[PDB]
Amino acid sequence: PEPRTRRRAYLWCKEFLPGAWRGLREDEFHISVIRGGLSNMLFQCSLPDTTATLGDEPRKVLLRLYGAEAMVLESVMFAILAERSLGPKLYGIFPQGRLEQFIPSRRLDTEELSLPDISAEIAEKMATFHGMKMPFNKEPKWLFGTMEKYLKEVLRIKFTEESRIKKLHKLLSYNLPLELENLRSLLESTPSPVVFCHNDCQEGNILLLEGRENSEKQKLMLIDFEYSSYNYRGFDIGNHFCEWMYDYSYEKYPFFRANIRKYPTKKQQLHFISSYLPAFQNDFENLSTEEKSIIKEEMLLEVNRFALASHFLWGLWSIVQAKISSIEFGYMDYAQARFDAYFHQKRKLGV
Numbered sequence: 039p040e041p042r043t044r045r046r047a048y049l050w051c052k053e054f055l056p057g058a059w060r061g062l063r064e065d066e067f068h069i070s071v072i073r074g075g076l077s078n079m080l081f082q083c084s085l086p087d088t089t090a091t092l093g094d095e096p097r098k099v100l101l102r103l104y105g106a107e108a109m110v111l112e113s114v115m116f117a118i119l120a121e122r123s124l125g126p127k128l129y130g131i132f133p134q135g136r137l138e139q140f141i142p143s144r145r146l147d148t149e150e151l152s153l154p155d156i157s158a159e160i161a162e163k164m165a166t167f168h169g170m171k172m173p174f175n176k177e178p179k180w181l182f183g184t185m186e187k188y189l190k191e192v193l194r195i196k197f198t199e200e201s202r203i204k205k206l207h208k209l210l211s212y213n214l215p216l217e218l219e220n221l222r223s224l225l226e227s228t229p230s231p232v233v234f235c236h237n238d239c240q241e242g243n244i245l246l247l248e249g250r251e252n253s254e255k256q257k258l259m260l261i262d263f264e265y266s267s268y269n270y271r272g273f274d275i276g277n278h279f280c281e282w283m284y285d286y287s288y289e290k291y292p293f294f295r296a297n298i299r300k301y302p303t304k305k306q307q308l309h310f311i312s313s314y315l316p317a318f319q320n321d322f323e324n325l326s327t328e329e330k331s332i333i334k335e336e337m338l339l340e341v342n343r344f345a346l347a348s349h350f351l352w353g354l355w356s357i358v359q360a361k362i363s364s365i366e367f368g369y370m371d372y373a374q375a376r377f378d379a380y381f382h383q384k385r386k387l388g389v
């Protein structure tokens with residue numbers, strides 16, 4: 039970072055954080071980039087090793103700059119999740135960004151989502167997240183409201199470059215407005231409890247906590263709640279299952295691989311929900327084998343139907359990003375991949 043912003047960040051840390059941060063000079067302030075870009079930039083700020091801690095205060099903190107009533111809701115949500123220890127602590131909030139607890143950890147990779155212990159804990163963390171009471175609108179308008187929003191943007195897109203017109207053209211040929219109504223119809227007739235959903239539960243949004251790699255059941259934290267809202271539970275689980283097929287670490291264009299064969303098997307899904315249901319309804323454990331098994335089979339139909347909305351939603355989303363995003367990513371190919379998966383899943387389900 040340039041000297042002007044380095045100023046900004048020094049002051050935030052000095053003005054907002056307790057103990058040693060308070061009596062610290064500009065010439066003892068360490069900050070380096072974690073993630074650059076023009077939106078949601080991340081930086082680690084730290085004390086010198088030479089400087090002694092006074093009280094509770096942390097040695098490292100993460101600074102997050104927004105870059106680019108939405109802010110009120112996200113801030114409140116983040117504060118609340120920090121109070122309940124479900125997210126990183128919140129140390130500072132200001133117009134340009136926030137200071138949060140730095141969680142020593144790494145992101146999971148796509149392959150890890152299928153490891154039984156990992157999958158089981160995600161299901162447990164997700165169930166916990168789904169139990170949160172939040173001061174937000176409890177009507178499930180997010181999913182279809184967001185899909186309509188992006189669809190309407192998609193119909194207005196026009197591309198200057200030539201290959202992009204052809205790609206958009208193939209996508210528009212599916213009759214997106216009509217297909218959206220097909221989806222709504224299917225989902226309106228699929229019962230799914232409304233709950234506080236993460237809405238974006240992918241490997242890059244799950245941290246594996248340092249020094250807990252040997253723990254069986256408490257080694258992960260869910261992060262990045264920008265899309266979170268009251269939603270059908272089926273979406274969050276179906277969305278997460280879709281995320282087994284996609285790997286965003288791929289180092290060449292289009293900067294992702296899709297592997298349709300990596301969608302969880304019946305067995306792997308059952309592994310996930312068998313960890314989910316006990317964690318979401320505490321007395322589920324005490325049902326009869328028969329009653330448990332009826333609930334589980336029903337739940338598989340549910341999440342596999344909702345997985346269609348994941349394909350449809352991120353497909354549309356991805357067309358819009360191709361237009362407006364600064365990030366280096368093959369959006370249009372990703373959109374085609376999500377729609378291919380959408381039509382494949384309808385075939386699999388017989389819808």
Ligand SMILES: Nc1ncnc2c1ncn2[C@H]1CC[C@@H](C(=O)Nc2ccc(S(=O)(=O)C(F)(F)F)cc2)CC1
Nearest residue numbers: 070071072082100126138139140141143144145261
């Ligand atoms: N509160 C949080 N919210 C979202 N993500 C978080 C949070 N806390 C941690 N993380 C991820 C953890 C894993 C990962 C990470 O640590 N990356 C990273 C860390 C440090 C550097 S560096 O400063 O250049 C270094 F090399 F160390 F010197 C560069 C990159 C990304 C950040």
